[PDB]
Amino acid sequence: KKIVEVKHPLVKHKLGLMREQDISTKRFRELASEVGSLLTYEATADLETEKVTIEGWNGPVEIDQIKGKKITVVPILRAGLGMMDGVLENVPSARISVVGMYRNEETLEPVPYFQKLVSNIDERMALIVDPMLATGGSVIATIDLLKKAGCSSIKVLVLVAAPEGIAALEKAHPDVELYTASIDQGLNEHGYIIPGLGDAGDKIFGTK
Amino acid sequence: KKIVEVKHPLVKHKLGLMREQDISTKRFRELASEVGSLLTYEATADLETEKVTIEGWNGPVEIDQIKGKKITVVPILRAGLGMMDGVLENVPSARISVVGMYRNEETLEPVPYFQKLVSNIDERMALIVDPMLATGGSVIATIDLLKKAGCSSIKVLVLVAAPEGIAALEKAHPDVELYTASIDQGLNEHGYIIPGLGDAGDKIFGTK
Amino acid sequence: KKIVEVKHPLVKHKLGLMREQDISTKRFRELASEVGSLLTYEATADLETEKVTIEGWNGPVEIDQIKGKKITVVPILRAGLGMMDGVLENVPSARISVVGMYRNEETLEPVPYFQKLVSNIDERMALIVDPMLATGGSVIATIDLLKKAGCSSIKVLVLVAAPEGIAALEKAHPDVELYTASIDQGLNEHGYIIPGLGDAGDKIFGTK
Amino acid sequence: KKIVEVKHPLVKHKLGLMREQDISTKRFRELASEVGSLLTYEATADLETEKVTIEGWNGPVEIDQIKGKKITVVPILRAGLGMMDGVLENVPSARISVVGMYRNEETLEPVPYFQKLVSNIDERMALIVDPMLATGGSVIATIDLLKKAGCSSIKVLVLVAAPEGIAALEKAHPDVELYTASIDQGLNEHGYIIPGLGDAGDKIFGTK
Numbered sequence A, B, C, D: 001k002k003i004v005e006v007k008h009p010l011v012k013h014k015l016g017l018m019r020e021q022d023i024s025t026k027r028f029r030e031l032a033s034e035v036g037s038l039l040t041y042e043a044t045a046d047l048e049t050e051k052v053t054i055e056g057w058n059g060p061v062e063i064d065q066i067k068g069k070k071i072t073v074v075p076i077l078r079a080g081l082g083m084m085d086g087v088l089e090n091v092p093s094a095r096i097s098v099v100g101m102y103r104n105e106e107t108l109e110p111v112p113y114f115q116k117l118v119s120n121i122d123e124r125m126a127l128i129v130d131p132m133l134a135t136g137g138s139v140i141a142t143i144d145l146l147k148k149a150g151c152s153s154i155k156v157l158v159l160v161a162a163p164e165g166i167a168a169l170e171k172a173h174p175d176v177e178l179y180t181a182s183i184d185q186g187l188n189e190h191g192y193i194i195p196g197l198g199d200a201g202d203k204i205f206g207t208k
Helices: A009-018 A025-041 A081-090 A139-146 A163-172 A200-205 B009-019 B026-045 B079-090 B137-148 B162-173 B199-206 C008-017 C027-041 C079-088 C139-147 C165-174 C202-205 D009-019 D024-042 D082-089 D137-148 D163-172 D200-205
Strands: A002-007 A049-056 A059-067 A072-075 A098-100 A114-116 A128-129 A154-161 A176-181 B002-005 B049-056 B059-066 B072-073 B099-104 B110-116 B125-129 B155-157 B178-179 C004-006 C049-056 C059-066 C072-075 C098-100 C114-117 C126-129 C154-161 C177-183 D001-005 D049-056 D057-065 D074-075 D097-106 D109-116 D126-129 D154-158 D177-180
Touching: A002 C049, A009 A025, A009 A114, A009 A154, A009 A176, A009 B059, A025 A081, A025 A200, A025 B026, A025 B079, A025 C126, A025 D137, A049 D154, A059 B009, A059 D009, A072 A081, A072 A098, A072 A154, A081 A154, A081 A200, A114 A163, A114 C202, A114 D126, A128 A139, A139 A154, A139 A163, A139 C165, A163 B009, A176 D001, B002 C154, B026 B079, B026 B125, B026 B178, B026 B199, B026 D126, B072 B099, B079 B137, B099 B137, B099 D163, B110 B137, B110 D109, B125 B137, B137 B155, B137 B162, B137 C079, B155 D049, B155 D074, B162 B178, C008 C027, C008 C177, C008 D057, C008 D097, C027 C079, C027 C126, C027 C154, C027 C177, C027 C202, C027 D024, C027 D163, C049 D009, C059 D200, C072 C079, C072 C098, C079 C126, C079 C202, C079 D024, C098 C139, C126 C139, C139 C165, C139 C177, C202 D009, D024 D082, D024 D109, D024 D126, D024 D154, D024 D177, D024 D200, D074 D097, D082 D126, D082 D200, D109 D137, D137 D154, D137 D163
Parallel strands: A002 A176, A072 A128, A128 A154, A154 A176, B002 B178, B072 B125, B125 B155, B155 B178, C004 C177, C072 C126, C126 C154, C154 C177, D001 D177, D074 D126, D126 D154, D154 D177
Antiparallel strands: A049 A059, A098 A114, B049 B059, B099 B110, C049 C059, C098 C114, D049 D057, D097 D109
16 A cells, blocks of 8 residues: 655656666666665665664763664565665665566566575565566565565565556555655556666666 | 754664774774765755656656756865765765865864865855764854855755754854754763764774 | 686785674675675786777877677676676676576586576677585586577686586586686585685575 | 886776766766776785684684785875775775875976874885876875885875876885876876876866
């Protein structure tokens, strides 16, 4: 149910640059992480904290610490690694739980091939990272895995989301929180988001 | 009159880590930027925008662009440089105006020694970045320089602030906006913020 | 045939930092990339160049450009990604051909579960990057994959290496270059490199 | 007397990109550090090591680490800061001793204005970093500074250097090592390196 289209000018601006078909795989990739950072700040605003004491240059000081077991960042392989740099900047001690998956372009169905989750995931907040949310198959498939491993409390970070994807996600896991940099118009006959920003995966890696 | 103490959980957490005695020049310097990045996001939430039509991956597309002349980051020399990496990760195109001055460890006042501002400051927003606001003599001294050079919209990003300094900054330039990561108890005999975080300048650079 | 063990003091130092059991994932991950950069510099020392004239700050000027199609970096999935940051800082436009295979002490002849190479792989140099070269199994397997695709210029970048692996690799693909930061004593009963540095994959990602 | 023009194809390639007139401050500032890192690698290849035994992941391990007092990096204020990022990446533990002095553009001679060096400078290796060595006035002037403070082993890292500056430096201090990415043709009427790369200070900071 909770959806957030971060409207911060810096996010709106940086996303703008990513849309130029002329951009380079290098700059494109970087921008992805910059936006990735901002979405992470916006999405971790509700982390619980706790007073602890340490020794400061002037004697014992009381400080705040995010409490609980380290959060886990879940990148959906290939596409997702492009935003990991920026996410990790805000949360460097996060445990990285990778999930490999790719979309069958004929059936538009997801095809999971690899999974490696941190342990005790039931005690952690999961942060799923992925460039797009087109049909929604990949994010939905990935949330099922996390929930199967026993994870509750999940937040999805996307750069651009298509209304269809959002709708499919809400039907499958209303208990999740969606933070996107933009909600586009919809999908074309091939499952690509429009306006959107092309094949994010290929662009980020420089493949075709 | 505008004073924002960013109480986001990642700021309190990274800030707490900076308080440790133990902390090395390397990690202290990173945390200075991390927190500095986050402080910018808050400080730059008001940026104005404009619509534009560029060539997208799938034809014409209207995007957002931050309007007007690039902003300028004004680091107060030495300590200030410690927070630039993070500030420029948000506004990489910003113009850097260095202003160097040190505090008279005796009289507790600012001693200017160098300044090189961008041109056309009239039409530019300025972000003064300095680690600590103790007496406020430094920030206030540099605001004076910028206002003399024609700048009208100024924002100050700080890690820790003493009420004494916030009180001084306010009665000197109330038309300024203060963004701090924490407001501390006050100054001690020799003018240092308590708890505060030591010689921010010395710790960033590793000098004695 | 061609084996290089970089003995630059900075490499030895950073690698030495990577051996403290107490180290953290964040720090270990960064260092894996710093060494990764230095290793990349040592392997691209023989890249071909070509003159080109452009518009310099003051009139035309002849410069040197790295001739040929862009090189492709090939990180072996999971661990390999931890050294990606460092490698890309040196070759920011390199195409990223990822290869993923599951490897255990039981996977004597690893098979990819996923892979996505760049096109015209036969007209490029390929830099395979993987933290540990224990039995050689994983790396020699991805060289077969690359050679079949048509690639005929391959360099391998590794953090630590066991004589076992180095020997196997040499027996399997002598026409390849091996750059390593350290050649350790050998392997133990369970397949780990000794001294080595433990399960590089798990430390880098923070899993188990 | 010892001069070293790094001829690495990656150093020539990154320097070439810097030659473009249309380049951006962000990109330009970024290449400065990239080349600066490589220069550091080249200049620190002769540092001494000392073995030490620490607790490894699987028990005792003998490691190598750099010997002696931590080195100090001396960026000549303003321009020099543009390369700091890269340098520090190879020696984060370094003590940053800054020195400010702008060149009198009528008398082409340095004008000192700030300095803050680390203690025991006479027991450390100095590392002076400044973008361009035109006439050699600034580097010679700051080496005077360091020698006066008792420093006796200095290395100068620069991106481009004019034969004039190299000659002046040698006459003045032949016991120093000079590392550069390019020895240009000479100085034009107004004392600017040719081809060179414009006014580094301005391009790096985005001023005028």
